[PDB]
Design a protein around this ligand. Structure first.
Ligand SMILES: CC(=O)N1C=CS[C@H](c2cccs2)CC1
Length: 127
């Protein structure tokens, strides 16, 4: 079973902002998770063909990954920080839904989520 089209990262009909909170989500949150040793499974959409996971997109109907989030941040796709924070939480939740407890990938997501939570605890006040 094929891969679906990726989540959109560009939509000229969609109103956009560049807020200090969104700048923090790129410069601090995304950057911190992206450079982590466990980032690599999350740096692009799940490739169900290459990974031989024909049921992945039968189970996961709202896919999200840090490659998509990175493009959305660099492209100023978002209106507010909460949209981006939701994308990160979707990515983690999908991993916990699809995979079994204790799997390596779940430990990887948990380590990235710990750092995510630490960083968004210091999300700056909106200017
Ligand atoms: C991110 C995710 O939920 N995937 C689903 C199944 S397998 C793959 C890996 C397992 C261990 C290292 S990568 C990552 C893609």
């Amino acid at each position: 079973s094929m891969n679906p089209p990726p989540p959109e990262t560009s939509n000229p009909n969609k109103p956009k902002r560049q807020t200090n909170q969104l700048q923090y989500l790129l410069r601090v949150v995304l950057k911190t998770l992206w450079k982590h040793q466990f980032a690599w499974p999350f740096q692009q959409p799940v490739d169900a063909v290459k990974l031989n996971l024909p049921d992945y997109y039968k189970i996961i109907k709202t896919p999200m990954d840090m490659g998509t989030i990175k493009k959305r941040l660099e492209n100023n796709y978002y209106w507010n920080a909460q949209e981006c924070i939701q994308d990160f939480n979707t990515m983690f939740t999908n991993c916990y839904i699809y995979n079994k407890p204790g799997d390596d990938i779940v430990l990887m997501a948990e380590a990235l989520e710990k750092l995510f939570l630490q960083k968004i605890n210091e999300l700056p006040t909106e200017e």
